[PDB]
Design a protein around this ligand. Structure first.
Ligand SMILES: Nc1ncnc2c1ncn2[C@@H]1O[C@H](COP(=O)(O)OP(=O)(O)O)[C@@H](O)[C@H]1O
Ligand SMILES: Nc1ncnc2c1ncn2[C@@H]1O[C@H](COP(=O)(O)OP(=O)(O)O)[C@@H](O)[C@H]1O
Ligand SMILES: Nc1ncnc2c1ncn2[C@@H]1O[C@H](COP(=O)(O)OP(=O)(O)O)[C@@H](O)[C@H]1O
Ligand code: BEF
Ligand code: BEF
Ligand SMILES: [K+]
Ligand SMILES: [K+]
Ligand SMILES: [Mg+2]
Ligand SMILES: [Mg+2]
Lengths: 525, 525, 113
């Protein structure tokens, strides 16, 4: 197709307009006084959301150049969401800040390459500063706060996340699903997380988020490589009569089979997923039988006297719910054989005492811990499915923030952290003036998230900004109460991870963009 | 379909406009202050790229005739990138200048074909002059420089390429792939790789490793479909007396032979790896004999007159270690003597001179390359996908640059080489005054790269040009720091190949383009 | 003063050191200094000489060294007698800057249909 081509300022102006039209839509959601965006997902009812990445992802624009700028920044939000839960709106605001300031500086005629280079220098130093600044978060209390604040000041959500991580342990798997009724509920259930994802992205169905959730999935527990579903087509027949999805957990699935699934599942009877049998060798057979007990199934191989041709409804495992993602699968609540489950537990422990060689102790300890943790599930309470999505999303942000916190701990939230580091870096300089002004752009931009958060209040942004700067250490602004104080004591806790991630990815993309003189895009008509 | 046809200046003017549009898109990227172009990739995030040939490919214009101009200059860009990875932008700028000056000379009424001949004559002399200027590049430091300069002054990248080329020697294969961390990382697949592996899991003695590794393995090089253990009996005796494992590089992983060798592996009597022979037919045979001599063995098959019983300890190959994978084998320090290995490479070089078909040419080069050393892999570290692509492209350019440098030497970069050769050629003349004009056209265009590099800096191009021309030898302009000096001592090194290649292709396409009198294209409907 | 735009470009080179309180004032200063070269380059371009080379050569010269557009020779403007009154240069510059400042600060325009 014939390409339109633009140069210099025309390109830059087009870009910047597209950026703004995305950012402004994202950034309205920021902080405690942010407010919701309505996304008209064609399928049905619109979804009201406060998640910035959910907003950004939808934004697509009519002008090919403005759209190009928008799609570019879109990347930032998705990256941040892929590192961490929170931080997608902060990362977008930072990116748009750098871009704006940087383009201003380029209009002064300064070299964009050196501008980019200077931004990168600042970010590196900034990241280092945050690291040192971060106070480890380990007190359940602090964990709660982190939760709460990521939940948009939702006390109850913080409570539940803290209690769940207490009950399963901080390393334990926790999951969130549409609850049955009005109230939030928490319970711990017999389930398993093993580190294998979908064997193909074509199994991604219901969620957009690169995952699949299946209700009452059947589990074919076969330590074999599936060449063609012919080997179990009467099982898929059976499963048709079920009308309930089948999870293959097998050593491999050939693309022949995968393509046959593509031919028959969504285009036909029932959705089917395949996952790699976890671990390897004797371990993988071990885990498959560990899951058979967890699900009341059997291991399907001729070493057992079983065959893919023969596995009954009852030779396959039964789970109530399974989640699969790019990298991991969580059997949420296997039917299983509870007494046998516990007996297995005791058995595996005995091998810890027998298989006392260091790495055997390790694997066995892992497996017992895995089985003993089970899984927690958080049931989101809502009157209406609209609020279901909204609250559920708010919870998952809390969840991902808490784990991130537990990893790296917390820094003074509300954007104080970024300002603080900014102030520390004021003496940082580059090789040349272009890099020096690039550094100043970076530092400057770090202000943006505070100002934005204030602005959403409709408080007077520059005033708050200036005072906070005047303050020192943890001194910040509480935007839910319009009071200066020790942010920590208030519990406005940001996990260093999210802030670090947001800054890196924001600068990363931003620095590139400024350097553009020319854009090649298809003529609209 | 009904063709539109235009003549004379209605043709050339339109054609030139197309050329200009493409060039201007490309040009911006030239040099250290050259700056990125955003190429829309409708399915995905746009590609931010500084690779000029990447730019060229996308350019395509609505106006049929302007399109023609673009399409033909596009061709020189691409051809440049085929000959050598770097130099695509230089070739474009050159082509633009020649075309521009040629069309101008034609407007004077010069015989176009004489111009073309004059251009061609000048170009030939310039190639010879570059050959004369070129100083061998050999020291690692120069390699680093060339890599740096081609990397867009990315010192780290130059360092990494140079040390990688050292670790695997000049002739080693080096490849670049998407890393995961922020930090770039270099790995090497040690030893004699060959690209065939096991086709069952039961060979794996190291299940946590997920591959088969053997220490002090003997190597039964039976390039055949092995049948039975019976033929191995005396071999197995010698093996068991040595107490060493055995690598079965069969033709194909087949036969009861291997099945019972797996049985012996499970009994711990002898541990055995088995893999396909690489390639087919005579080239398959050749690889097995190359493995053999390198391993200090000899191809143990009846098709070369030796039944498997007949193998001495000079026919069985050995290594300190071997590893075999799903798809690949590597042999670590085969016991074959270094003199035998070198000699074997000599016969392979004789075979290379005998080979007249890519089926054997590329494969023979791969044999000698792997015999010279392992394969290095450069993992490009970047925060963001956009960086992934952008950084990767620069790395790849650096890689192909260094290669070219090693093979043909280097000249003073920043376009000084072209300037110098142009000045040396000022005495050249043709058969007739039309031809002489064409020569001067060529010599004048040689300035264009230098000027364009300067212009991107926003510096007076002709001022810099004149001062450079006034200087002698490697005296030039450093566009990264805006001061003149010995270009070589600064380390701004260009591979002669890329300079030479870029010039030739530029000249060829341009010299044709100026002789256009009529263009025929479908009407715009 | 050296008439041939020499004076302006001379002073422009002299003041390159000057800098302001912030990037906005710095770009403003740079804009002013760059413009002052414009007379010389225009005069030359009318000749169809290369403005860049002549400008640089004048800048690299000293005092009244300048480009005689009538003859294309370089020389001392005074010896040739290419004399601008000082007032003319000064007034030209100041008034030019005045309008520019007016225009930059201009926020609204009112006219009939
Ligand atoms: N009560 C509060 N006072 C000040 N800042 C707050 C408060 N509650 C939340 N914030 C800040 O708002 C941001 C969280 O809002 P959110 O929309 O989740 O941003 P993101 O999507 O980037 O996580 C964090 O910077 C957090 O510190
Ligand atoms: N520091 C420098 N000073 C001057 N010229 C440079 C410098 N670094 C690189 N160059 C020049 O930049 C030119 C263009 O390089 P590049 O951007 O890779 O375009 P191409 O695709 O033609 O190689 C090269 O001829 C190189 O000599
Ligand atoms: N021979 C010459 N070479 C170069 N510059 C000249 C020459 N003669 C006059 N000038 C300069 O040309 C400039 C502009 O000329 P002109 O446009 O006629 O005057 P003004 O711009 O004041 O109306 C004057 O500043 C003058 O000194
Ligand atoms: F704005 Be986010 F996703 F916390
Ligand atoms: F623009 Be290139 F390939 F250096
Ligand atoms: K938000
Ligand atoms: K380039
Ligand atoms: Mg948040
Ligand atoms: Mg290059």
């Amino acid at each position: 197709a014939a390409k339109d081509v633009k140069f210099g300022n025309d390109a830059r102006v087009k870009m910047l307009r597209g950026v703004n039209v995305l950012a402004d839509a994202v950034k309205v959601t920021l902080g405690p006084k942010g407010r919701n965006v309505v996304l008209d997902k064609s399928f049905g009812a619109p979804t009201i959301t406060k998640d910035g990445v959910s907003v950004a992802r939808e934004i697509e624009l009519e002008d090919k150049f403005e759209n190009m700028g928008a799609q570019m920044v879109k990347e930032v939000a998705s990256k941040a969401n892929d590192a961490a839960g929170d931080g997608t709106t902060t990362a977008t605001v930072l990116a748009q800040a750098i871009i704006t300031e940087g383009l201003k500086a380029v209009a002064a005629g300064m070299n964009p390459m050196d501008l980019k280079r200077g931004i990168d220098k600042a970010v590196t130093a900034a990241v280092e500063e945050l690291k040192a600044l971060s106070v480890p978060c380990s007190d359940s209390k602090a964990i709660a706060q982190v939760g709460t604040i990521s939940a948009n000041s939702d006390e109850t959500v913080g409570k539940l996340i803290a209690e769940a991580m207490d009950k399963v342990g901080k390393e334990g798997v926790i999951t969130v699903e549409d609850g049955t009724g009005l109230q939030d509920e928490l319970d711990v259930v017999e389930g398993m997380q093993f580190d294998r994802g979908y064997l193909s992205p074509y199994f991604i169905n219901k969620p957009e988020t690169g995952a699949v959730e299946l209700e009452s999935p059947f589990i074919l527990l076969a330590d074999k490589k599936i060449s063609n579903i012919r080997e179990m087509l009467p099982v898929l027949e059976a499963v048709a009569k079920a009308g309930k999805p089948l999870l293959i957990i097998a050593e491999d699935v050939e693309g022949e089979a995968l393509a046959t699934l593509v031919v028959n599942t969504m285009r036909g009877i029932v959705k089917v997923a395949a996952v790699k049998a976890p671990g390897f060798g004797d371990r993988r057979k071990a885990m498959l039988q560990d899951i058979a007990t967890l699900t009341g199934g059997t291991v399907i191989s001729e070493e057992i006297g079983m065959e893919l041709e023969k596995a009954t409804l009852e030779d396959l495992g039964q789970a109530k719910r399974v989640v699969i993602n790019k990298d991991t699968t969580t059997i949420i609540d296997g039917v299983g054989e509870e007494a046998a489950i516990q007996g297995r537990v005791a058995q595996i422990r005995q091998q810890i005492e027998e298989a006392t060689s260091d790495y055997d102790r390790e694997k066995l300890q892992e497996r017992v811990a895995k089985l003993a943790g089970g899984v927690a599930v958080i049931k989101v309470g809502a009157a209406t499915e609209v609020e279901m999505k909204e609250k559920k999303a708010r919870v998952e942000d809390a969840l991902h923030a808490t784990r991130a916190a537990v990893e790296e701990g917390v820094v003074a939230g509300g954007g104080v952290a970024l300002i603080r580091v900014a102030s520390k870096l004021a003496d940082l300089r580059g090789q040349n003036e272009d890099q020096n002004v690039g550094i100043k752009v970076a530092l400057r931009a770090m202000e943006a998230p505070l100002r934005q958060i204030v602005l959403n209040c409709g408080e007077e942004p520059s005033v708050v900004a200036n005072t906070v700067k005047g303050g020192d250490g943890n001194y910040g602004y509480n935007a839910a109460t319009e009071e200066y104080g020790n942010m920590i004591d208030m519990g406005i806790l940001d996990p260093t991870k999210v802030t670090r991630s947001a800054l890196q990815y924001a600068a990363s993309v931003a620095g590139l963009m400024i350097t553009t003189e020319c854009m090649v895009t298809d003529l609209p008509k």
